Design an enzyme around this catalytic site. Structure first.
Site, short mmCIF file in Angstrom:
data_model
loop_
_atom_site.label_atom_id
_atom_site.label_comp_id
_atom_site.label_asym_id
_atom_site.label_seq_id
_atom_site.Cartn_x
_atom_site.Cartn_y
_atom_site.Cartn_z
N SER A 37 9.13 -25.66 -7.76
CA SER A 37 9.63 -24.52 -6.87
C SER A 37 9.09 -24.83 -5.36
O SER A 37 9.67 -26.06 -4.80
CB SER A 37 8.96 -23.31 -7.13
OG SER A 37 9.58 -22.20 -6.69
N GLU A 46 17.55 -20.55 -14.26
CA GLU A 46 16.88 -20.25 -13.10
C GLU A 46 16.62 -19.13 -12.84
O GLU A 46 15.64 -18.35 -12.79
CB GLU A 46 17.23 -21.35 -12.05
CG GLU A 46 17.26 -22.70 -12.08
CD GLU A 46 15.73 -23.39 -11.94
OE1 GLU A 46 14.87 -22.46 -11.75
OE2 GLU A 46 15.60 -24.62 -11.86
N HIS A 100 13.31 -20.12 -14.40
CA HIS A 100 12.64 -20.65 -13.54
C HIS A 100 10.79 -20.75 -13.89
O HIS A 100 10.46 -19.64 -14.24
CB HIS A 100 12.78 -20.28 -11.96
CG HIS A 100 11.85 -21.12 -10.89
ND1 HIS A 100 12.48 -22.20 -10.39
CD2 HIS A 100 10.91 -20.43 -10.42
CE1 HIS A 100 11.48 -22.38 -9.66
NE2 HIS A 100 10.52 -21.76 -9.38
#
Length: 566
Positions: free
Chosen positions: A214, A347, A467
């Site tokens: 990230s 995600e 994610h």
């Protein structure tokens, strides 16, 4: 976050502390650094392996008082032996579990780990930069435990860096010396430390890999883009992110005043007087109010964070981002090292939580004008051209007559992750020596082993690989448990850490000594590829054409009449 996850996490915090005392040994050791001697301790893992642990190594002066918002300076060396058998505190930040502010301004440390302080050969060095949108995160072992990686013969290093306004305040006026990107400059100085000191821990200074997820991936990418770090490392891994993601930079030069005003400042909008107020404010007051800084227009245009990496207004000694990231890719030294990049299979599933609080967000997909890249869209998002672009996005993700939550989360996957990766690969191709870039897709779904980000995204009992779901297979955390060695989860830890260390070592992710990889032919992406191929990681490992590719080309066609901006 709920009252139940608050008492539940409180208990796991009390458990992790007793487990940590239990997994401690009496075997202290001392290593050399260029700043002096450090004392580490050997620790145990639930799989009955052991490792040497050096925590709280300072890589910069504590950035307090008059150094607040300032670029970091080298720390003061010491005589004697510095105690490093305990973690220091995290950066000041809002705790996602409680909502309270925690951490301290004295946060600039790194931790070093290895199963063998005196290897018979120099080992590959892996540097992890944590994510957390540049506003949360830490290198504490209750979240990023080295336990899985030290089964391998590497040196693993977890760094911290200034977060939030303290990490990324930016002021226009050249006299006050607050260009921005302080937190990134932290990362640079830690990289310099790792380069000059890893050998003392058995690391090979000529074989260093930096990686992150990230915001950590964006950080990693920035470290590959800036001249400041040229030649410092040798491999890069970008996990669900990079620097041209829409959330990975912002022009926040005006937002300092706003923050000052939320904190009780009285007076005018000039930088000097704003800075003077912010410089004497309680750290935890500034951080608690950062949430309130963004305007309703900014949130509408999908600005995700008020403070973050930025094009610096003027150049100074430690400048990191002197131009917009798209421009920096064109000369970036990092273009010419081996790179791996990837994403999870779903995600946007991360945004389940946000949708639950704002179901009105799903109606944005009626025209999708809010998700048109901001450089293309108009202020009010009302121009006919913008409604046109929005329609191309809509065609990509709205499966029915009315958009759903799943359409929404699928869009976010591309808006925040897949489309930026695409733009980066194509930009890099026009500006590179031809070093390979390898793609993976993390597609392994499990509820039987989880990590704390799943509490925040409210991912409890939610199918699909969101994610941050992959972190669980790289790092130990206080919600982990020992897994049977034949279980699918244990095999995935083994595979994941095997590939990452194999890549770190050789700049090539393929190994036949990794179970499941015997039929795998992992080829890098070529400029002449119309279709991306990626190692898809699930219960089996399989090379495939990226499934997201049609939707990716849909997003690219928004730039049909503005190919210069692509």
């Amino acid at each position: 976050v709920s009252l139940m996850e608050k008492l539940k996490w409180k208990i796991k915090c009390i458990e992790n502390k007793f487990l940590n005392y239990r997994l401690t040994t009496n075997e202290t050791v001392v290593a050399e650094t260029e700043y002096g001697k450090v004392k580490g301790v050997k620790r145990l893992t639930v799989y009955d392996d052991s490792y040497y642990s050096f925590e709280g190594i300072p890589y910069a002066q504590p950035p307090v008082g008059e150094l607040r918002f300032k670029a970091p300076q080298r720390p003061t060396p010491w005589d004697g032996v510095r105690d490093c058998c305990n973690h220091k505190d995290k950066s000041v930040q809002v705790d996602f579990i409680t909502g309270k502010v925690c951490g301290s301004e004295d946060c600039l440390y790194l931790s070093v780990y290895t199963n063998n302080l005196n290897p018979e050969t120099k080992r590959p060095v892996l540097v992890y930069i944590h994510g957390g949108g540049f506003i949360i995160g830490e290198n504490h072992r209750d979240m990023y435990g080295p336990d899985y990686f030290i089964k391998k013969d590497v040196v693993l290093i977890n760094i911290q860096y200034r977060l939030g306004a303290l990490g990324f305040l930016s002021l226009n006026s050249e006299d006050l010396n607050v260009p921005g990107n302080a937190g990134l400059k932290d990362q640079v100085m830690a990289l310099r430390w790792i380069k000059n000191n890893c050998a003392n821990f058995g690391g090979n200074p000529d074989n260093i890999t930096v990686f992150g997820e990230s915001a950590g991936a964006a950080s990693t990418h920035y470290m590959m883009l800036t001249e400041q770090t040229r030649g410092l490392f040798h491999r890069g891994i970008l996990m669900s992110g990079n620097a041209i993601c829409p959330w990975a930079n912002t022009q926040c030069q005006h937002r300092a005043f706003t923050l000052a005003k939320l904190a009780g400042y009285k007076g005018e909008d000039n930088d000097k007087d704003v800075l003077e107020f912010l410089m004497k404010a309680k750290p935890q007051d500034l951080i608690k109010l950062e949430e309130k800084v963004l305007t309703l227009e900014e949130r509408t245009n999908k600005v995700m964070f008020p403070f973050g990496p930025t094009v610096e207004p003027y150049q100074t000694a430690d400048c990191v981002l002197p131009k917009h990231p798209r421009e920096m890719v064109k000369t970036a030294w990092g273009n010419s090292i081996p790179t791996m990049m990837g994403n999870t299979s779903y995600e946007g599933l991360f945004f389940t939580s946000i949708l639950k609080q704002m179901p009105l967000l799903v109606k944005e997909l009626e025209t999708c004008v809010n998700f048109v890249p901001s450089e293309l869209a108009d202020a009010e998002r009302t121009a006919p051209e913008t409604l046109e672009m929005g329609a191309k996005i809509k065609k990509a993700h709205v499966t029915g007559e009315t958009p759903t939550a799943d359409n929404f989360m699928d869009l976010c996957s591309h808006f925040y992750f897949w489309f930026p990766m695409h733009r980066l690969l194509q930009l890099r191709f026009n500006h590179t020596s031809g070093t390979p870039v390898y793609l993976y897709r993390f597609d392994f779904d499990s509820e039987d082993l989880i990590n704390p980000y799943r509490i925040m995204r409210s991912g409890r009992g939610v199918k699909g690989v969101s994610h941050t779901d992959e972190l669980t297979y790289f790092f130990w955390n206080q919600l982990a448990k020992r897994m049977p060695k034949e279980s699918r989860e244990y095999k995935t830890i083994e595979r994941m850490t095997g590939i990452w260390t194999q890549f770190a070592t050789t700049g090539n992710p393929y190994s036949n000594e990794i179970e499941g990889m015997e039929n795998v032919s992992w080829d890098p992406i070529e400029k002449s590829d119309e279709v991306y191929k990626c190692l898809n990681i699930s219960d089996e490992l399989k090379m495939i054409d990226v499934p997201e590719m049609g939707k990716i080309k849909q997003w690219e066609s928004m730039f049909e009449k503005h190919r210069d901006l692509f």
